[PDB]
Structure 1
Amino acid sequence: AMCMPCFTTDHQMARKCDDCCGGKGRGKCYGPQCLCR
């Protein structure tokens, strides 16, 4: 499912997840998975 992981130890996990998913607000970190909308 995931675009990439979300690691809480990476304080920029939400920005990286957005980058994976195409830009601002497009990715959500839901537990250990970055999921694209």
Structure 2
Amino acid sequence: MCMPCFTTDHQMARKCDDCCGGKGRGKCYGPQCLCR
């Protein structure tokens, strides 16, 4: 899993999905960033 999902706003999911892989392989799930 990557850093949580509660930072910034116009640039938060821009690195979460990529942390797992990218192309929809990572999003903000509640209070925990995980892969698809």
Name the Cα RMSD after superposition. 1.8
TM-score normalised over the length of structure 1: 0.58
User: Which structure 1 residue ranges, 4+ long, deviate > 6 Å from structure 2?
Assistant: none
Offset, 1:8: 5.0
Aligned residues: 36
Deviations 1:4-33 (A, max 9, x none): 211153432212111101112111201221
Listed as ranges, the gaps of 5+ residues in structure 2 are: none
Offset, 1:35: 0.8
% same residue = 100
